[PDB]
């Protein structure tokens, strides 16, 4: 029973301890629904944390660290019970144990604690976890241990309020440089996900990622054989291209766009959608970035998905089209018109997502304002496909911005 | 408003876990 285990664990004799703590560990590691609450409510936690101090019995340290790892794998309440027992400084001690299993288990437990949230992340950081954690990365490290290390690194990079300290990012990025040249799939996936959490942290974090030189190593993973690596890399570079034009251009300079035909035609709708999201952040850029998308032969594929993709992909393709009109030249917009953008663009005017309707109206407005002489041609194209009637109907839409813009488009371009 | 957009809900949902138990 738990009473028995607690009584045996609190002895001053390390053999009785070891016996009881192994029993608790077994309770916590034998299935996927462990009795965490019952072991917390038994009072065992400060006992396990004390066991962590016993450098004379490494087996005891290991069993207690495993038990605490699994307790800290549960909810925030359970992780926090572990944190409030003072486990963190002792786990950081055990990062220097001569015993490999104790060391790895300590890394694991700290992973769960850091994962609970940004203030736990920053407490563990402030006590100096990063330098000893990165000191494990070596040619000789066992691969399972290295995978746990890079998972912990994912957790050090994630959470955003606040994002990790600048100094920590500076310390982690060289480790990510090393690890992104790895061939193990889980290491790559976790490395790229850590980078993607960093590039979502702010434009200054993006700049740090860029300044590390790692982007040219990240872009070619969009064609990795493993779809998990592909999608992680798409997230990482996509977050970069949410930044400034210069930051986006760093990515474009690596020939990113050549990897997208295979993503726009991927069987998985979610990958089509994510790829179009990326490209819509490209076409929101300057004239040269719009031209890069054109030159890469991606516009017909975008328009095809605007017409025949799942609705999620279609929404993203609408953004791609409309964003192109922010800074795109008259000739670039004309190329869109030649590629038959108008009918599938207009088909979206009737959906219940008011955001998409606004996006498409904004795009049609910019297109008409841009096509000085051709505005009559384009207007007739809009009329042909039924778009004009849909604008007329949107004059009755609930949303002021939408029906305002519909009135204005009709008055400015369909009232001659 | 037109322009760049952050990663959208429903994207990249196969993320690494924040926590793992060690099961035998």
Q: What is the 3-state secondary structure (H, E, C) of chain A?
A: CHHHHHHHHCCCCHHHHHHHHHHHHHHHHCCCCCCHHHHHCCCHHHHHHHHCCCCCCHHHHHHHHHHHHHHCCCCHHHHHHHHHCCHHHHHHHHCCCCCHHHHHHHHHHHHHHHHHCHHHHHHHHHCCCHHHHHCCCCCCCCHHHHHHHHHHHHHHHCCCCCCCCHHHHHHHHHHHHHHHCCCCHHHHHHHHHHHHHHHCCCHHHHHHHHHCCCHHHHHHHHHCCCHHHHHHHHHHHHHHCCCCHHHHHHHHCCCHHHHCHHHHCCCCHHHHHHHHHHHHHHHCCCHHHHHHHHHCCCHHHHHHHHHHCCHHHHHHHHHHHHHHHHHCCHHHHHHHHHCCCHHHHHHHHHCCCHHHHHHHHHHHHHHHHHCCCCHHHHHHHHHHCCHHHHHHHHCCCCCHHHHHHHHHHHHHHCCC
- Using CB atoms within 10 Å of the CB of residue A270, give its burial: 0 to 12 exposed, 13 to 18 middle, 19+ buried: middle
Among the listed residues A139, A142, A136, the one whose alpha carbon sits nearest the alpha carbon of residue A107: A136
Q: Are A359 and B11 a contacting pair at CB < 8 A? A: no
B9 contacts chain A (CB < 8 A): no
The experimental technique behind this entry is: X-ray
Query: For residue A1, what are the CA distances in angstroms to A17, A42, A286?
Result: 15, 10, 69
Output the domain CATH number for residue A231: 1.25.10.10
Instruction: Please judge whether A115 and B6 are an interchain contact, meaning their C-beta atoms are less than 8 angstroms apart.
Output: no
Burial (0-12, 13-18, 19+ Cβ within 10 Å), A267: exposed
Q: What is the DSSP letter of B16?
A: P
Rounded to 10 degrees, what is the CA torsion of B11, B13, B15, B19? 140
**Those residues with Cβ within 8 angstroms of residue A378's Cβ, 6 or more apart along the chain or in another chain:** A337, A342, A367, A368, A371
Pick from A105, A232, A326: CB nearest B3 = A326
Task: Say whether B19 and A73 touch across the interface (CB within 8 A).
Answer: yes
Locate tokens 């030249």: which residue? Answer: A329
Number of domains forming the structure of chain A: 1
**A205 touching B (Cβ < 8 Å):** no
> Which of A58, A108, A59 has its CA nearest to residue A87?
A108
| Residue A344 tokens, joined | 């599938």
Are A320 and A363 contacting, i.e. CB atoms less than 8 angstroms apart? no
* Token pair recorded at residue A175: 């480790």
Whole-angstrom distance, CA of residue A209 vs CA of residue A348: 37
Q: Is the distance from CB of B21 to CB of A25 less than 8 angstroms?
A: no
| Rounded Cα gap, residues A78 and A84, in angstroms | 10
Place of tokens 């699994």: A70
Element (H, E) at B1: none
Q: Which domain holds residue A396?
A: 1-416
Residue B2 distance to chain A (closest CA, Å): 6
Closest-CA residue to A154 (of A126, A201, A192):
A192
Kindly tell me the burial class for residue A308, based on how many C-beta atoms sit within 10 Å of its own C-beta (0-12, 13-18, 19 or more): exposed
Q: List the single residue in B with minimal CA-CA distance to A194.
A: B16
Nearest to A45 by CA among A78, A22, A12: A78
SS3 for B11? coil
- Chain B contact for A344, CB < 8 A? no
B contacts of A106 (beta carbons < 8 Å): none
């Amino acid at each position: 029973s738990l009473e028995a285990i607690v009584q045996n664990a609190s002895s001053d004799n390390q053999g009785i301890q070891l016996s009881a703590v192994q029993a608790a560990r077994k309770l916590l590691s034998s299935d996927r629904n462990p009795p965490i609450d019952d072991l917390i409510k038994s009072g065992i936690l400060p006992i396990l944390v004390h066991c962590l101090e016993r450098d004379d019995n490494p087996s005891l340290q290991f069993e207690a660290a495993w038990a605490l790892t699994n307790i800290a794998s549960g909810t925030s309440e359970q992780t926090q019970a572990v944190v409030q027992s003072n486990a963190v400084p002792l786990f950081l001690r055990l990062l220097h144990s001569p015993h490999q299993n104790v060391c790895e288990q300590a890394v694991w437990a700290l992973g769960n604690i850091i994962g609970d949230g940004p203030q736990c992340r920053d407490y563990v950081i402030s006590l100096g976890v990063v330098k000893p954690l990165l000191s494990f990365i070596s040619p000789s490290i066992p691969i399972t241990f290295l995978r746990n290390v890079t998972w912990v690194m994912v957790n050090l990079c994630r959470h955003k309020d606040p994002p990790p300290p600048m100094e920590t990012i500076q310390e982690i990025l060289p480790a990510l440089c090393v690890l992104i040249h790895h061939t193990d799939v889980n290491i790559l996936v976790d490395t790229v996900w850590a980078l993607s959490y960093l590039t979502d942290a702010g434009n200054e974090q993006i700049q740090m990622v860029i300044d590390s030189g790692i982007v040219p190593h990240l872009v070619p993973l969009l064609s990795h054989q493993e779809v998990k690596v592909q999608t992680a890399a798409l997230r990482a570079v996509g977050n970069i291209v949410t930044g400034t034009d210069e930051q986006t251009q760093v990515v474009l300079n690596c020939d990113a766009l050549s990897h997208f035909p295979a993503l726009l035609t991927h069987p998985k709708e979610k990958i089509n959608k994510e790829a179009v999201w990326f490209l819509s952040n490209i076409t929101a850029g300057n004239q040269q970035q719009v031209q890069a998308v054109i030159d890469a032969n991606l516009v017909p594929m975008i328009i095809h998905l605007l017409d025949k993709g799942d609705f999620g992909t279609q929404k993203e393709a609408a953004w791609a089209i409309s964003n192109l009109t922010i800074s795109g030249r008259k000739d670039q917009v004309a190329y869109l018109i030649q590629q038959n953008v108008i009918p599938p663009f207009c088909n979206l005017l009737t959906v219940k997502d008011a955001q998409v309707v606004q996006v498409v109206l904004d795009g049609l407005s910019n297109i008409l304002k841009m096509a000085e002489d051709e505005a009559e041609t384009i207007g007739n194209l809009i009329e042909e496909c039924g778009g004009l009637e849909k604008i007329e109907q949107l004059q009755n839409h609930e949303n002021e911005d939408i029906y305002k813009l519909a009135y204005e488009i009709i008055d400015q371009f369909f009232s001659s | 408003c037109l322009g760049r957009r952050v990663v959208q809900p429903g994207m990249f949902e196969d993320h690494p876990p924040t926590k793992k138990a060690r099961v035998s």
